């Protein structure tokens, strides 16, 4: 979904 947001 995102590069590193989780």
């Amino acid at each position: 979904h995102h590069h590193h947001h989780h």
Partner: antibody, heavy 117, light 114 residues
Framework: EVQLQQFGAELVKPGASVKISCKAS????????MDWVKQSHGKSLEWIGD????????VYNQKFKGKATLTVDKSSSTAYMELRSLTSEDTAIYYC??????????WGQGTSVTVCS | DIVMTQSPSSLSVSAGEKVTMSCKSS????????????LAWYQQKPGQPPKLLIS???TRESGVPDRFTGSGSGTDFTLTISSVQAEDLAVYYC?????????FGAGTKLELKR
């Protein structure tokens, strides 16, 4: 040069719904998520959520679940936030920001949403 | 759920003075697989949107002068201006850029005194 241009209605009655628009130019729209940020008059900053344009996947701050809906139109490089059941507490400037690997490195100018009480 | 705290709230300044704002997170912003603290700093002037100064705790964006240095790790971070100039009189925010939900500090305002 990168640009995110914001449009939308400014003045709304309580109980209205408003669809804010964010038009992205100067970069591959699908290569970055899009964040939405609320800044109230207290200058408090609150992240509302993001959308991935490639998949239409969203993540919401629980505080704004239902209150905000996030859509994109990939064809026109445009992201949308729909604010629903507007209360005076929803009065703020709303920003879209581009969010890839380096946080929110470009911001729209902001759409001021005023809800008369 | 991560909470950001900055200090001080306000800060008087002067020509060429060095300033230091603190940012402390309730939980580590350290992504160990990425080997990266995912903390970001923004500068906001009245009328304008916030502007990214630093991402990943220490990385200055293009057009950000060397005078701005971010440092820290885990849960404790600082933003330092070696020689304050007039254009730096703004509000500064740090941001959890690490875990959903993304959260912001309340800010640190560089109000000049006199």
């Amino acid at each position: 040069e990168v640009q995110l241009q914001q449009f939308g209605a400014e003045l709304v009655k309580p109980g209205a719904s408003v669809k804010i628009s964010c038009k992205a130019s100067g970069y591959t729209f699908t290569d970055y998520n899009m964040d939405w940020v609320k800044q109230s008059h207290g200058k408090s900053l609150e992240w509302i959520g993001d959308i991935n344009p490639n998949y239409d996947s969203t993540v919401y701050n629980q505080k704004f679940k239902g209150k905000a809906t996030l859509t994109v139109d990939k064809s026109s490089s445009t992201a949308y936030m729909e604010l629903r059941s507007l209360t005076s507490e929803d009065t703020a400037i709303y920003y879209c920001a581009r969010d890839g690997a380096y946080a929110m490195d470009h911001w729209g100018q902001g759409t001021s949403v005023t809800v008369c009480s | 759920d991560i909470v950001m705290t900055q200090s001080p709230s306000s800060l008087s300044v002067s020509a060429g003075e060095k300033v230091t704002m603190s940012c402390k997170s309730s939980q580590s912003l350290l992504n160990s697989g990425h080997q990266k603290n995912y903390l970001a700093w923004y500068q906001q002037k009245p009328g304008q949107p916030p502007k990214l100064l630093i991402s990943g705790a220490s990385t200055r964006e293009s057009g950000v002068p060397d005078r701005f240095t971010g440092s820290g790790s885990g849960t404790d971070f600082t933003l330092t201006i070696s020689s304050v100039q007039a254009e730096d009189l703004a509000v500064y925010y740090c941001q959890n850029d690490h875990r959903y939900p993304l959260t912001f500090g309340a800010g640190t305002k560089l109000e000049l005194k006199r």
